[PDB]
Ligand binder design. Structure first.
Ligand SMILES: Nc1nc2c(ncn2[C@@H]2O[C@H](COP(=O)(O)OP(=O)(O)OP(=O)(O)O)[C@@H](O)[C@H]2O)c(=O)[nH]1
Ligand SMILES: Nc1nc2c(ncn2[C@@H]2O[C@H](COP(=O)(O)OP(=O)(O)OP(=O)(O)O)[C@@H](O)[C@H]2O)c(=O)[nH]1
Ligand SMILES: Nc1nc2c(ncn2[C@@H]2O[C@H](COP(=O)(O)OP(=O)(O)O)[C@@H](O)[C@H]2O)c(=O)[nH]1
Ligand SMILES: Nc1nc2c(ncn2[C@@H]2O[C@H](COP(=O)(O)OP(=O)(O)O)[C@@H](O)[C@H]2O)c(=O)[nH]1
Ligand SMILES: [Mg+2]
Ligand SMILES: [Mg+2]
Lengths: 25, 439, 430, 430, 439, 25
């Protein structure tokens, strides 16, 4: 009467941190 | 003059430290008992090794090193080895139970017991220095004691000193070979906690060193001995600019000034050339241009990856020995002309060069043939993004079922730490993907 | 430094541990008088992990002998190495268990456990840094099973942060030696799965198969099977005693080898194994040791591992070797037989290398495998136990010791849940 | 480097291969202890192609012995060179085949083939570069025939890209030694033509004729016939072991000698062959070897090659020679006897020269011929088999092992088709 | 100054390379260990052998060669022979299974496994050169490894470099003598794939060398030794114009400029004279005119064919040693006057001449008597069209029944390749027939 | 019940490739 501990894992939406485009304008 | 403290953490740290200090004692002519066979000057002079060896008593040189581990066996092996009478007895700090490849242990449970003693010894060593410039930390990501205690010590040192440079030499988890089942978690947690506190961490790979040994050195059974010797050669070539006068000297700050374009991308790949066996040494004419060209061959990377899959952001060429600057100029021009090597568009000046007069020295009983010139190269390329993605994929595969998670959770590692580390690693991958896009 | 308290319980305990201490005293140059007469400094460098030094160059093995009838202890005391053991640690009863787990756990063990635990505390307080407890015992044996379960529970309560390792002799798939072995095994695992950190499953039948097949032995004895088990035990903790290129203590093995808290049973193996005549025709290389380790006929457990998949693999090597060689062999193993490893664990193999080879060998290797195939053992035990319990087979012998039907029911239910967990973790899920 | 796994099966297998390993150990300076005591570096330069080195200067021949009754293996083990073979590779049954191909292929071989294939895999994984498999066996023998067909099928499935060479003892045209030899031969070729790369046909009767006629022997033994066959076998693979002016491995022979996939049977020959007294009156020149090779009385196959035509001719020479001399002799042979070669193959002769002569000879040469004349063997076998099958001669002995009439029918039909193919390729067509 | 890379492929390639490098070391006075017994100049000068031998270390000369084979026995024989300490260990590349005289294997299946390593070594050797002019490839048509791997390497080199000259010395299949049954298919496939990627392939024949040895050298048992020595003499006479200063020097490009009238007809026949034994050397006065006349005798052709059956399109006369240009002028005028030798009408200027001062050198223990002058002649004639037709006829005879075809088809050689090769060979025969018609 | 695999082989009509007559006019 057991069930495996499986979780739905996702890194859904991760943005970059280095502002490599901040001076693109 | 200038000073640098070498910190060796964990199994790989202490072993690489043994190799490195053997090589230093060979280069500077320092006997295993701290004495000099040509002890004609005592307590000063140049004698440029004042950076790595402090002057005590009368004619005894003491290395500025701190060996830390939670498992006393390797430190005891140091305490009974050839250099047992070289190191100061107060430089060898031991716990009584290693971290069992559990980052949580070495970071929270066991590391907190000796971190204060380690920091006190580091402060005592640094207070004896006048031009302290950098800290060298040797550790492996997979090793729990190395990983966890290194993360803790890096945080503590970043808090205590702040403006001193922090360089790391670390063994990246091999893409195929592994020694611990929980290397993904330890690696991900250590990277997440270490990223913003390190100036430059140099990547090496034992599998790449296996391939290099087999192909170039013609050695079928290269145990950790040859690996440690090659790593020590690389470290010595990096520190030779401080230790010996060169035609173009390079301090330690210039490395992070030239190799780190963004504060979050500071993982250059180490290479080394020439690496030839003594048998083919007499069928080869090692010119400057040939070594420079061999440095950029994908088969000579100390990290198993394909540099052709990404682009270079910065490359540092450190030459040693009989080196003519005109030949280096022409070789760099030729390398830039080679259309198979791509650099990021936003870095039109992608090379930094340094030339030191001191030629490399071969350890007696070693593997490499003696050469009149050698080149240590350090390159920051976007090719390691694929290795980061592989590590993140392995972490996801193991974490979707919470495999090994109870071991970390029991030590106080709250579960949300893994989610935070995973999101931060995804952000690092996004950073690499964004910086590699031309405009 | 790190110290290991070896607890011997039952007939398996006493015999296997007598052979084990013979082997350990041989490795460290300790003659049957306790005086050190070795030839290398590494023998005394880590002599304190299994020995206490009483001034006079005499070393006492940190072992505790437990039994419920003095016959086996008399046989041990009068045999070889009798005088090295300090006679303080021969703690025995008088009634015996009669192979009844209920008796040995609730009456005789309940009477003797106070003395046994006082001896345990005496040996533990004298330690410098207690690392873990090693227990040698059988499951079918009433003394072994009951006394071991009771002692493991009490010591786990006493030291919840130490390593609890057990080397258990499990029931054989064909030839059982005890009528009430299934009930003893069920009630034993019902506590082992809760209190122990890791358990190594040894089957005597697999050892007989290895002896007749590989070693070409015609008259194998329980003592020679104990020699094999003792070689395995010495290979397990070679990193706690001698230096090497890559060391691994007991906690490192427990961390790398137990993915989930309840799936801690392991299948041990050993290499190399050759007959005396065939020694002159086979070279000792790392590929040879690797092929002997990952072989179904060399598994000391009563199960063909090719029926399930592995979760974690530990391979501790002894002797001067090339790490590149070992790593390439492990890569070849994982690549050619990828279907035998669970998809949710990349890098299934853990490795370690000690520089000191066993006596008389250039190189060796100890195998430790965590395979889902071991569910066959627990399923067969559950089937036999259920069939016996439906008819209340020998049930009065246990109900007379204080047990009710509810304890058997809970033990069987937990066993079914453990089998179901092993079956659940065979799903790739990705 | 390239390695050859020699598989011995049947009485022919065991005896011929014992003599073969005697000859090979003599050529490489390996004494009956396995220790190298030779006198030239070339003996160890390519010692690994047939030997495994176990540290201690001992070399183990990479051979696998297969049989269904331990008598022949006991005779081999107790005789000369018994202790060099590592005893791991004596894989035998207990029932024997009784010369019944059906038995040895479906029951006894079916029981023993798992162990035999495990040994094969063990020897193959230890290789550096597996090149091909050599099988020595008889066709009339039930053990040889059945076990060889089963093993060849299984190994061909296991390694489809390796060279499968067999040296088969074929039925004699006049004196048969087994009552059920025709059925065994038919059912054997029905699988050999499908799974093997090339088969060398040896007849004992032709060897007897050569022994009484050329060597002037009065009491020839099966062992001396095995000596001749072993000299041929050593001459076949001399390029895999020693350098020379022009080398040719086994795959080169298979490519140059098999024009179409089903016509892979070859007739072997050997030169020089002289009696002891006549040695003092004949010089050893390349014309002499060439005339001895292309001689009907020197063919070890049970057929006069002058009745058909050749498709491919292989001539491997040993010893210091002039390539101009050999090429001129081959030109003379092809020009004077052009009517014995098929018109649709120009340049019928393949050549190779090894610089190391056999023990005691200045020069020698091994003949390998692919002639359409061998259709006589297959036609006689088909006629005898049909005559026996019309009356169901001994048919129950095979139907009791699981065979039906359809298997015999398909075997006979395939045999008739093979004979018809050989007859088809005798047409000049141009 | 100028440089040329010598590539040896297959059995015949490696054996002829052994002979050639022995002859070069004899001519330049280079000891078997790369040292010079008169080592007075190190690392430069003239010392004109800088073309073939690179300067490494101090006093060690390293030949610019690459030995490739799929069967390791002959390369190991090189690795344990007299010149094992001469060649660089990285110059010897081996597979582990030769092509079994199957062009399909060496071209598709096995050659693709080491072609990348061979090309990388070739690039490493070429990057050390400054005036690289040509590539020398030694191979036999019949040999599978030679044939297939040579076709593959020729395609790859033609793609990679393009404008560097590509000269081949190859053993044409003998008209009567053969060593492999499948020589027609391998030869036809190799020719079809190699035609448009070679600048000039020089033809030799072992049967013609047998006849030459027996008639001129008076040797009854001339094994591959004498064949290789004669081939090495021819190769050395061809390269002497680069290696030594002459009265009229000839580079490598002039050969394909003067000998190739049409892009598809580039198969000149090699000859050599004088070839005399030491016994008749003292009964002979070897003048320039006599050697020039003997060069055009049909009995001295290195390829078994009748030059009187066709016409000459171009003839190159390379003289060595004590040679007077006036005598060469008069001898060429006499040869043109000789009405038995026919040249194509569209080539009124059919001779190219070169005179080098260096006389030929005899190998100790050799067969040829020492002469003060020798002439190596290379002639492109339409007489080889009959040999091409013979090869095509043998190919048709074997292919009408699909003999040996399954061996090639299994390796991935699609059947249409044989039809394409046959049509291309028929087109080559048509080219020869058309260029040989006057107007 | 077999037949030899004989094919009717012909290089029917093959033209030259070198334009040796292109400037004949
Ligand atoms: N190149 C090289 N790598 C090493 C050496 N020693 C250990 N390693 C690497 O270190 C990794 C394991 O981490 P360790 O350093 O051994 O472990 P640790 O730092 O002692 O920390 P713990 O896990 O608590 O034992 C392995 O993957 C090895 O590849 C060495 O001497 N040379
Ligand atoms: N003149 C001369 N010819 C040779 C020599 N060695 C081999 N040959 C010729 O080479 C032809 C056979 O091809 P090989 O070069 O031996 O074969 P390979 O290049 O090794 O390729 P494989 O077929 O795969 O073995 C024969 O017809 C010989 O005439 C040599 O030393 N001298
Ligand atoms: N390997 C091994 N197994 C043993 C030995 N002695 C007994 N056994 C096993 O242990 C079981 C007997 O249980 P035992 O411990 O003697 O009874 P207890 O008094 O109730 O503990 C049998 O199944 C035996 O197979 C031994 O010396 N070696
Ligand atoms: N050349 C040779 N032939 C043999 C030898 N022994 C047996 N034979 C032949 O093999 C046949 C016997 O078959 P055999 O293999 O012994 O029976 P099996 O047990 O069914 O395999 C007979 O026709 C013999 O002529 C031998 O030592 N040398
Ligand atoms: Mg550690
Ligand atoms: Mg070859």
């Amino acid at each position: 009467k057991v069930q495996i501990i499986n979780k739905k894992l996702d890194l859904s939406n991760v943005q970059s941190k280095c502002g490599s485009k901040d001076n693109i304008k | 003059m200038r000073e640098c403290i070498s910190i060796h953490v964990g199994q790989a740290g202490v072993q690489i430290g043994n190799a490195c200090w053997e090589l230093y004692c060979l280069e500077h002519g320092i006997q295993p008992d701290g004495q000099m066979p040509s002890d004609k000057t005592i307590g000063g002079g140049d004698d440029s090794f004042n950076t790595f060896f402090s002057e005590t008593g009368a004619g005894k040189h003491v290395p500025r090193a701190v060996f830390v581990d939670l498992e006393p066996t390797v430190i005891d092996e140091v305490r009974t080895g050839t250099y047992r009478q070289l190191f100061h007895p107060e430089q060898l700090i031991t716990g009584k139970e290693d971290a069992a490849n559990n980052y949580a242990r070495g970071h929270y449970t066991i590391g907190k017991e000796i971190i204060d003693l380690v920091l006190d010894r580091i402060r005592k060593l640094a207070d004896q220095c006048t031009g302290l410039q950098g800290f060298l930390v040797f550790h492996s990501f997979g090793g729990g004691t190395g990983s966890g205690f290194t993360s803790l010590l890096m945080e503590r040192l970043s808090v205590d000193y702040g403006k001193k440079s922090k360089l790391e030499f670390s063994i990246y988890p091999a893409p195929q070979v592994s020694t611990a089942v929980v290397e993904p978690y330890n690696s991900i947690l250590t990277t997440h906690t270490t990223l913003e506190h390190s100036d430059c961490a140099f990547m090496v790979d034992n599998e790449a060193i296996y391939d290099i040994c087999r192909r170039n050195l013609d050695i079928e059974r290269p145990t950790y001995t040859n690996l440690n010797r090659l790593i020590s050669q690389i470290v010595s070539s990096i520190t030779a600019s401080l230790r010996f006068d060169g035609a173009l000297n390079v301090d330690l700050t210039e490395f992070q000034t030239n190799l780190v374009p963004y504060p979050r991308i500071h993982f250059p790949l180490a290479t080394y050339a020439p690496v030839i066996s003594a048998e083919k040494a007499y069928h080869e004419q090692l010119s400057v241009a040939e070594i420079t060209n061999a440095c950029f061959e994908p088969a000579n990377q100390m990290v198993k990856c394909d540099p052709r899959h990404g682009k270079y952001m910065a490359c540092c060429l450190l030459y040693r020995g009989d080196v003519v600057p005109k030949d280096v100029n022409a070789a760099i021009a030729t390398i830039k002309t080679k259309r198979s090597i791509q650099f990021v568009d936003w870095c039109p000046t992608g090379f930094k060069v340094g030339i030191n007069y001191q030629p490399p020295t071969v350890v007696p009983g070693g593997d490499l043939a003696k050469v009149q010139r050698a080149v240590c190269m350090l390159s920051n390329t976007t090719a390691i993004a694929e290795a980061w993605a592989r590590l993140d994929h392995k972490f996801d595969l193991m974490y979707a079922k919470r495999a090994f998670v109870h071991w970390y959770v029991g030590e106080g590692m709250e579960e949300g730490e893994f989610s935070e580390a995973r999101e931060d690693m995804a952000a690092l991958e996004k950073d690499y993907e964004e910086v590699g896009v031309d405009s | 430094m790190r110290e290991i308290v070896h607890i011997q319980a039952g007939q398996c305990g006493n015999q296997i541990g007598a052979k084990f201490w013979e082997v350990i005293s041989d490795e460290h140059g300790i003659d049957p008088t306790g005086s050190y007469h070795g030839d290398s400094d590494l023998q005394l460098e880590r002599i304190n992990v299994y020995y206490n030094e009483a001034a006079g160059n005499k070393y006492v093995p940190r072992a505790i002998l437990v039994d419920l009838e003095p016959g086996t202890m008399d046989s041990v005391r009068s045999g070889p190495f009798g005088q090295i053991f300090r006679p303080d640690n021969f703690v025995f009863g008088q009634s015996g268990a009669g192979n009844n787990w209920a008796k040995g756990h609730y009456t005789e063990g309940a009477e003797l456990v106070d003395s046994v635990l006082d001896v345990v505390r005496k040996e533990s307080e004298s330690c410098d840094c207690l690392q873990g407890f090693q227990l040698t015992h059988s499951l079918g044996g009433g003394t072994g099973s009951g006394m071991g379960t009771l002692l493991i529970s009490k010591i786990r309560e006493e030291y919840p942060d130490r390593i609890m390792n057990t080397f258990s002799v499990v029931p054989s798939p064909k030839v059982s030696d005890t009528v009430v072995e299934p009930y003893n095994a069920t009630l034993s695992v019902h506590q082992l799965v809760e209190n122990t950190d890791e358990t190594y499953c040894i089957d005597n039948e697999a050892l007989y198969d290895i002896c007749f097949r590989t070693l070409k032995l015609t008259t194998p004895t329980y003592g020679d099977l104990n020699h094999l088990v003792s070689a395995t035990m010495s290979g397990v903790t070679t990193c706690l005693r001698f230096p090497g290129q890559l060391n691994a203590d007991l906690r490192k093995l427990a961390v790398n080898m137990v993915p989930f808290p309840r799936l801690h049973f392991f299948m041990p193996g050993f290499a190399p194994l050759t007959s005396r005549g065939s020694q002159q025709y086979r070279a000792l290389t790392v590929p040879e040791l690797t092929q002997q380790m990952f072989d179904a006929k060399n598994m000391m457990a009563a199960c063909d591992p090719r029926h399930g998949r592995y979760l974690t693999v530990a391979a501790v090597f002894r002797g001067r070797m090339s790490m590149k060689e070992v790593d390439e062999q492990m890569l070849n193993v994982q690549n050619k037989n990828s279907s035998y490893f669970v998809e949710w664990i990349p890098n299934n193999v853990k490795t370690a290398v000690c520089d000191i080879p066993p006596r008389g060998l250039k190189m060796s290797a100890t195998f430790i495998g965590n395979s889902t195939a071991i569910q066959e053992l627990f399923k067969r035990i559950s089937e036999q136990f259920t069939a016996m319990f439906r008819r209340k087979a020998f049930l009065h012998w246990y109900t007379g010791e204080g047990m009710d039907e509810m304890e058997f029911t809970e033990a069987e239910s937990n066993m079914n849940d453990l089998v179901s967990e092993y079956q659940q973790y065979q799903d790739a899920t990705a």
